Design a protein around this nucleic acid. Structure first.
Ligand SMILES: Nc1ncnc2c1ncn2[C@@H]1O[C@H](COP(=O)(O)OP(=O)(O)O)[C@@H](O)[C@H]1O
Ligand SMILES: Nc1ncnc2c1ncn2[C@@H]1O[C@H](COP(=O)(O)OP(=O)(O)O)[C@@H](O)[C@H]1O
Ligand SMILES: Nc1ncnc2c1ncn2[C@@H]1O[C@H](COP(=O)(O)OP(=O)(O)O)[C@@H](O)[C@H]1O
Ligand SMILES: [Mg+2]
Ligand SMILES: [Mg+2]
Ligand SMILES: [Mg+2]
Ligand SMILES: [Zn+2]
Lengths: 651, 614, 638
DNA sequence: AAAAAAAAAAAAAAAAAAAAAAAATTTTTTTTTTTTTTTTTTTTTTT
């Protein structure tokens, strides 16, 4: 055999401390519950909060952070022992239970640039964007061979010597028996582990301006291989180590470094929100007690900082809630995504509304008229340059799939790009193809666009068709088109100015002392935890300088986010009464005689107008948590479309 | 797998707070006082009693027995750490090693820089600063093993064995910690020695030499180096504990430090010590594997049986007028009769008094010539068992180089050393030569020279020496000038049939066969231990002949010489014999002046010995 | 981790078969009982009869005897599993259990001359004489190390690759930690096994006369190390294998072959001895407690007629007396020495050969065939270590036995004097300057001497007819003058007895054929009814085997002299010393000393032992007195 | 709205910096064993 340790004092102490920490039963069983949850979910990787670990035993936390491999092995042994104690069969099912880390890393939290050799063999939490990924390959961790000549069955094991001294003996795949009998490998019986290599680059918006970006190579293994794709703003918690070179004889002293990832995370904004019992109870209470005016309350509480534009705010809320897709048995599809175009006079806060949607709605992609040009906007087809094979790169729409694309300077956008996105706006999919590849990417995103009317400022004395240079083909697929006019009414100016000045004079309680400048400079960002991958919530915003007073509260941002997320899943069904009402209203709307004279249509009326009527009714039902599209929902939809589709020509 | 720091603390507690009433019921902290003396450098060896250890912590004794070397080192380190807190005054620098130790400690304190962390190879080896040794006195519970039974299962174990010392080398200097001095840096390198050999270092590891990247050759020094007295002996199985058809087995005992110069060949020794291996590198082993020789690292050597090293009633019995007769009777009580021969053998044991005014020996030589089956061999064997230093030679089994010395290839280094035969081993003791008359002529000449000159002048090819054989001779033979002229006493034992005497002898022998012991008498015979103690107490009691006895002794000599001349051998040797026998009687009587009773008993013994010849 | 074995059909079959063979409850139970016995005795080797294995499973027997290594591995795994099943706590004590073999090996029973290449990897049984016996060295199989710097403890495992390919990594003894910290080996925790190498030589009598000897090297691992010594005749069963050389880019075809002994057994299977037999012995002793001694005496040498007193004395010798080890270490011998001084053709030599065949540890010596160092102990030098070693002689070997000295009279006076200590106190004290030793040889001497002039001249005194000195004669406690009496009636008796014995034939085994002039059949020396059937051609008689067993059981008993027998013996000894005990015209055949009183006591004790008396009574004393009276006097005619 | 020019990109080809792979028996030493010689010891023969 060989050397076998008997009394490793450090290993015994580490195992004891980690098992004590994982007991947690007296410590409100946080990690007991986590272990039980992973057992039920059939997972074999425990994510541990380093902050809790440090609180329990700062010594163990420091030892783990500064000595990665040894302490991680001890932690995994303790986790396997705990899993066996809770349930032995599962522990025997899974050979090794891995431990990934999470929380606030004081100094270990770095970027690919600040990640220097001082962090070798330490636990580092590096932020960045995945520049490239590799195919998921299986590495044999235990091979099984059968010898026909002797009917024997052997099993060879290969250890994970990724960042350890490896010799030819350990990495030789048997191909003969001791008597030179050919073997045959039993692939089914053999054990493989999935392995992938990615590249994390410093975020361009974080990198020093004008310099080339700093990268790092990351190794992912079983249960972490496909946690990211190129262009993902990922946080990788791992162990930084030097990769061994090939058996040489002369060494230059240069060692490639790599990050053995122990955990991968995406932007927490798109993550599944945590709904506690009290939170769901509050949502139930809100929906039940207030249903008649809940949609109006949410619409008015949507963007507190932007005054007026009540109809536009309601339309934006409908866009956020979305409709419901129709998946017909014969494959025909109907989008449930509302498209909104805000056009009007300069300085009407349309860009502010788009920015608010970007900040709030999950999977919201900003874009500018000329910022994205075709292949950048939709998907693109390139070549690997190393394999000679075609490859697909997701554009803004694809990345915004099941989300929102907030486009600004839509008018400035070239006609080619608008023609290209025509398909996305209605079918919600991108159809690209080159000679060696063809795909139909899913882009189920709602387009919220902003534009400036021709002549810079809206012309009250010209038809909306002439004011808007967008042709009918592109106008139709916009479900709602709102003309936001900078009317010069003295009273509206009074209200707007009062709101703006109040918002400017507001200061955040506690953090601001009356003279602080909150800007930081490229260091505090890494010093403190990133508020982009981080881990009690009220319902109505407490009175503050934002508003003076009234008998109508304003919904909290977090509560509104949770409520919208819950309500978006609802798929209210269209009732016969609402269906008949919508059909008759669509007939009347299409019949031009209904609308008065001196009134010009913003956009043409079409079957798509009917479809957006249905979608708006569905969105109102979702807001109400109704589960059925009712007469009030149909009324609100018809009201909104009637307001949006007609504008009075002044003279 | 145990915490050696905790074990060290336990042994420290034992050493610091163990006590006993060894001194007239006075709690004195035995090991504390021993530590005081060790710190004062008035004591080299410290013998820890595992009986004392078990008195409180039997499991610690078990751990020591299971792994002695480790716990030997632990006890040594505990004593090392304890010495400073027991030190009470300044050492007087007993020797050059003490001077070196003080110099090294002084300069280490000088260049201390206490906070600075020093490389592990940048300190003085512990064995280099000891000046003391620690050994274990095996526990009484441990039953002594047998050389044959001590096998691989005892490796690393504290075994206690008993046997005969068949050989022992002379104390040699064995290097413990080699020292080297550099020609560039003036820093001392050290190389502790664990293997039987070593390779001397070439380059110096001193920080200064490494920094300067100089050649830094260093030279081996016998001055600063540390040595320890080294002896290699071979112990042999006792006859009574050998298998039926087997020859006794021998174990190589290695003795170091204060244990040297305790055991000499022929001694009955009980050796407690650690059974350890020695790697057998070099040899092209037949079988692959780390095969290794074996030896016994001695810890406590004690002398047993005749090799061993008083009360008011004891002094009373010594002073009793019948003490001489009691001693003469207690010799071989299972042998009936022969009271006078027993007295003569007692006188041979006691000896006379050596005089060097021309050195005249004070030994008494006795030759029992007799008819077959008259207890000659029985008495020879009894004396062999009794006398503290004795050898037994029966016939020609041990002849030639078995009596004298021979040149033999040494082992510790490899060379021609001198091994002593039966006479050498009996030097300053007794040699019981049974079957004397059948011995070879050369052996008889050697015994002749030994009986007068106390030497053995060998001038053979490979050897040219003069061994010292100051041994009394108790010979036995059956039926003479060639022997009567030489031997101090020549005693004839004829078994003439007689009804009453044979009946008494038969009753005695039958009772012996029945009860495996001598028939009860007026006085209980004295044990071999007590007899040896009294004989030794008599040895160092040299009396002197007063001027008054000159006339009486001369008259007796001339009278007996007239008798010899008239009858159909007396010489100056006769008067010498009377003198030394009288001195032996005085020794037995515990007086410094030979008396009229002493001379009377000497002449009576001579008269009866000669009457035996008729 | 490396290439472990998941399932192995052959190994599984072998282990299942061996476990079945070892599990004996539906069968007789021999091997279940044997495993229980070894558990009780605290051993870790089981002796399995190849005959039983072949009987229960021929295939396993052939596999074990033709491919021993892996087969023995499977057998030992099964043995450990079975021992765990019986009791796991004991099975945990010993790492492994070993399987030695015995019984009959058809073609695998060979001599060192016949142990050729054909038997490589097979199990072989070799009987031979030990020549060399190396020291018992410990071989480390598991070494424990301690790092003082890091407080870590490590264990290194070394596989027993005596005959397998070994690579240096296996044998690297660790001295430094991973970061070059010093490691101290803990001897008290490491594991070592005794290892020894001996040499077995073709037996001198069985080897061809013309040619030189042939020998084989034998490796003995733990539990088999001190089982044999030089000069012993032993049977070693084990695997004959090839020893690997050492690493080298060049090699000759030559390989060094050895024998890894799996069991070693003494040739002296007769040196050692059921409830049925024990009860049979008890009833035999109890029933006829007075004439049992006489019946044993007559049945001792059935093929020799007459010599009643000589046979009684030989029985007393075979029984031996009771030694007296006194409180002071003094020693009184218990053995009994007999000197048959006799005319030619009086069956004294035949009595010697009978005692050779019967008694345990009987050594045959001749007058000039065993001189000095060959007859007693000796001292030599190793010639390799330059150190002195003892060598046991005939009598040292015969310790607790008998030495049959044929033609004792014609031994040199040197040898006869050398034997005095052995005769009296039963030991040899031999010393050279390097080494002095006191070897034990408590042997009893049975000497066969012829008188001066060839034939005992009855006109001359026994002192003259015996060309030996009184000092030598006193050594022999019993001295029998065996004359070729010229009585026609006794001549008729002797002739009839001789012709009947010459006419006898074996029962059924023989029908007129000739006796033959060995490896084909199991070696008798190593092979595993109160009265004889009253054949008329042999009797016109206790059985040999029952006599052997009864003498063995009666040897241990230690009768104690009683006061009445002591008084009787003392009075008789006084008379024997007196002159009146011998009339006119009768001469003493040996002077009467206290040695003769010891002779009386020893003979009485031997008689009491023959009767299993537990007390030496007046009957025993009178019998001893009568035998001494017959032996110590002779009537000289004019 | 269509044509021409500009450039922008994609892909393919090419040339170094570092790392990785390939190729590799012969001479001398020592140990064991075996034999020869010397001297001592033992044995045998003659007086
Ligand atoms: N109704 C309004 N209420 C509050 N602020 C407004 C309003 N209209 C315009 N603004 C202000 O005008 C500024 C810039 O408007 P912007 O979002 O650029 O609109 P546009 O995209 O039409 O230029 C914003 O900081 C916003 O606060
Ligand atoms: N006087 C005696 N008293 C007791 N036992 C005796 C006496 N004489 C002889 N013996 C016994 O007789 C035996 C012969 O004596 P031993 O000394 O061996 O003869 P030798 O004198 O020839 O050496 C011994 O065993 C001894 O015990
Ligand atoms: N009393 C006897 N009983 C039986 N056989 C005898 C007897 N006497 C002589 N013989 C025979 O004579 C032969 C003598 O041979 P052996 O005994 O060797 O010589 P010795 O008798 O001189 O010792 C033997 O073979 C034996 O069978
Ligand atoms: Mg704008
Ligand atoms: Mg004697
Ligand atoms: Mg014969
Ligand atoms: Zn130096």
């Amino acid at each position: 055999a060989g050397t076998v340790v008997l009394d490793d004092v450090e290993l015994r102490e580490a195992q004891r401390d980690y098992l004590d920490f994982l007991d947690d039963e007296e410590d409100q069983g946080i990690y007991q519950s986590k272990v039980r949850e992973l057992i039920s979910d059939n997972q074999y990787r425990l994510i541990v909060n380093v902050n809790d670990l440090r609180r329990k035993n700062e010594k163990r936390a420091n030892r783990l952070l500064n000595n990665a491999f040894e302490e991680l092995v001890a932690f995994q042994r303790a986790l396997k022992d705990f899993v066996a104690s809770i349930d032995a069969t599962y522990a025997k099912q899974y050979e090794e239970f891995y431990v990934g880390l999470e929380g606030s890393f004081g100094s270990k939290h770095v970027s690919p640039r600040t990640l220097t050799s001082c962090f070798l063999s330490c636990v580092v939490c590096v932020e960045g964007i995945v520049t490239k990924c590799s195919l998921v390959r299986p590495k044999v961790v235990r091979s099984v061979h059968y010898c026909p000549a002797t009917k024997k069955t052997i099993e060879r094991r290969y250890s994970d010597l990724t960042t350890l001294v490896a010799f030819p003996s350990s990495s030789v795949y048997p191909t003969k028996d001791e008597e030179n009998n050919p073997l045959e490998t039993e692939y089914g019986l053999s054990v493989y582990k999935d392995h992938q290599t990615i590249t994390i680059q410093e975020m361009p918006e974080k990198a020093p301006a004008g310099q080339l970006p700093r990268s790092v190579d990351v190794i992912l293994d079983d249960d972490l291989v496909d946690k990211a794709k190129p262009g993902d703003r990922v946080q990788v918690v791992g162990t930084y180590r030097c990769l061994p070179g090939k058996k040489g004889g002369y060494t230059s002293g240069t060692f490639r470094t790599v990050l053995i990832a122990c955990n991968v995370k995406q932007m927490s904004k798109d993550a599944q929100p945590s709904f506690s019992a009290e939170d769901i109870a509050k949502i139930k209470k809100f929906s039940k007690t207030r249903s008649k005016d809940i949609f109006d309350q949410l619409a008015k509480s949507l963007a507190p900082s932007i005054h007026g534009h009540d109809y536009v705010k309601k339309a934006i809320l409908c866009l956020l809630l979305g409709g419901v897709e129709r998946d017909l048995e014969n494959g025909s599809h109907i989008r449930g995504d509302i498209n909104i175009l805000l056009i009007g006079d300069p300085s009407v806060a349309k860009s502010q509304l788009l920015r608010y949607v970007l900040c709030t709605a999950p999977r919201a992609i900003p874009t500018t008229g000329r910022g994205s040009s075709g292949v950048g906007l939709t998907a693109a087809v390139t070549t690997d340059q190393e394999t000679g094979e075609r490859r697909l790169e997701a554009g803004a729409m694809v990345l915004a799939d099941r989300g929102v694309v907030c486009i600004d300077e839509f008018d400035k956008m070239s006609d080619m790009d608008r023609t290209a996105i025509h398909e996305v706006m209605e079918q919600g999919r991108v159809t690209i193809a080159k000679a060696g590849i063809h795909a139909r990417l899913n882009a189920r995103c709602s387009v919220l666009a902003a534009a400036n009317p021709v002549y810079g400022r809206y012309d009250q004395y010209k038809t909306p068709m002439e004011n808007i240079g967008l042709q009918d083909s592109l106008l139709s697929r916009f479900d709602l088109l709102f003309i936001m006019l900078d009317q010069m009414d003295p009273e509206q100016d009074r209200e707007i100015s009062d709101h703006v000045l109040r918002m400017h004079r507001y200061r955040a309680p506690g953090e601001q002392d009356g003279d602080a400048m909150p800007l930081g400079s490229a260091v505090d960002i890494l010093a403190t935890d990133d508020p982009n991958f981080s881990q009690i919530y009220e319902k109505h915003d407490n009175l503050l300088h934002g508003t003076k007073k009234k008998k109508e509260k304003m919904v909290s941002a977090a509560f509104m986010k949770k409520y919208i997320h819950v309500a978006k899943i609802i798929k209210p069904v269209l009732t016969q009464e609402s269906a008949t009402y919508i059909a008759e209203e669509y007939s009347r709307l299409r019949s031009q005689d209904s609308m008065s004279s001196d009134t010009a249509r913003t956009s043409p009326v079409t079957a798509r107008t009917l479809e957006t009527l249905i979608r708006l009714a569905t969105a109102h039902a979702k807001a109400r948590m109704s589960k059925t599209v009712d007469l009030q929902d149909a009324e609100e939809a018809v009201e909104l479309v009637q307001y949006a589709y007609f504008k009075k020509v002044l003279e | 797998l145990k915490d050696y720091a905790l074990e060290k603390e336990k042994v420290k507690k034992f050493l610091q707070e163990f006590y006993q009433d060894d001194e007239l019921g006075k709690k004195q902290f035995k090991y504390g006082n021993q530590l005081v003396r060790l710190a004062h450098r008035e004591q080299v060896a410290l013998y820890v009693d595992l009986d004392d250890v078990a008195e409180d912590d039997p499991e610690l004794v078990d751990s020591i027995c299971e792994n002695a070397r480790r716990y030997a080192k632990l006890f040594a380190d505990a004593v090392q750490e304890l010495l400073p807190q027991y030190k009470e005054r300044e050492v007087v620098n007993k020797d050059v090693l003490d001077v070196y130790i003080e110099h090294r400690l002084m300069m280490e304190q000088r260049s201390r820089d206490p906070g600075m962390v020093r490389s592990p190879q940048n300190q003085y080896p512990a064995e280099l600063m000891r000046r003391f040794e620690l050994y274990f006195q095996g526990p009484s519970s441990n039953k002594p093993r047998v050389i044959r039974e001590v096998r691989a299962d005892s490796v690393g174990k504290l075994v206690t064995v008993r046997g005969i010392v068949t050989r022992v080398s002379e104390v040699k200097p064995k290097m413990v910690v080699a020292t080297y001095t550099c020609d560039q840096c003036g820093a001392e390198t050290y190389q502790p020695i664990q293997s039987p050999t070593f390779m001397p270092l070439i380059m110096c590891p001193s920080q200064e030499c490494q920094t300067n990247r100089s050649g830094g050759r260093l030279y081996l020094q016998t001055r600063g180096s540390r040595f320890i007295k080294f002896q290699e002996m071979k112990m042999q199985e006792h006859s009574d504990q050998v298998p039926v058809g087997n020859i006794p087995r021998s174990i190589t005992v290695l003795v170091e430090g204060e244990n040297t110069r305790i055991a000499q060949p022929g001694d009955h020794v009980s050796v407690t010590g650690i059974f350890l291996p020695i790697l057998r590198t070099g040899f092209r082993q037949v079988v692959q594997g780390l095969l290794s020789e074996t030896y016994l690292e001695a810890h406590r050597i004690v002398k047993m049986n005749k090799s061993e090293d008083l009360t008011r009633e004891e002094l009373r019995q010594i002073a009793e007028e019948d003490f001489y007769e009691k001693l003469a009777a207690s010799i071989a009580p299972e042998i009936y009769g022969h009271e006078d021969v027993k007295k003569a053998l007692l006188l041979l044991l006691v000896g006379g008094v050596d005089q060097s005014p021309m050195k005249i020996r004070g030994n008494i030589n006795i030759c029992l010539m007799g008819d077959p089956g008259v207890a000659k061999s029985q008495l020879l064997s009894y004396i062999d068992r009794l006398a503290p230093r004795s050898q037994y030679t029966t016939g020609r089994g041990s002849s030639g180089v078995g009596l004298t010395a021979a040149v033999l290839r040494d082992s510790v280094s490899g060379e021609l050393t001198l091994e002593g035969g039966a006479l050498v081993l009996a030097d300053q003791g007794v040699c019981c030569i049974d079957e004397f008359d059948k011995m070879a002529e050369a052996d008889r000449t050697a015994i002749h020279e030994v009986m007068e000159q106390q030497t053995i002048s060998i001038a053979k090819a490979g050897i040219l020496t003069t061994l010292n054989a100051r041994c009394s001779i108790l010979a036995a033979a059956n039926p003479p000038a060639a022997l009567l002229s030489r031997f101090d006493l020549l005693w004839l034992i004829q078994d003439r049939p007689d009804r009453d005497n044979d009946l008494r002898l038969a009753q005695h022998i039958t009772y012996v066969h029945q009860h495996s012991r001598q028939p009860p008498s007026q006085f209980e015979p004295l044990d071999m231990k007590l007899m040896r103690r009294y004989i030794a107490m008599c040895r160092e009691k040299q009396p002197m002949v007063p001027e008054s006895l000159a006339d009486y002794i001369t008259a007796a000599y001339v009278e007996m010489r007239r008798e010899a001349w008239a009858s159909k051998y007396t010489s100056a040797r006769t008067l010498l014999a009377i003198l030394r026998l009288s001195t032996a009687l005085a020794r037995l009587r515990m007086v410094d002046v030979v008396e009229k009773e002493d001379v009377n008993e000497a002449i009576r013994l001579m008269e009866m010995s000669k009457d035996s010849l008729l």
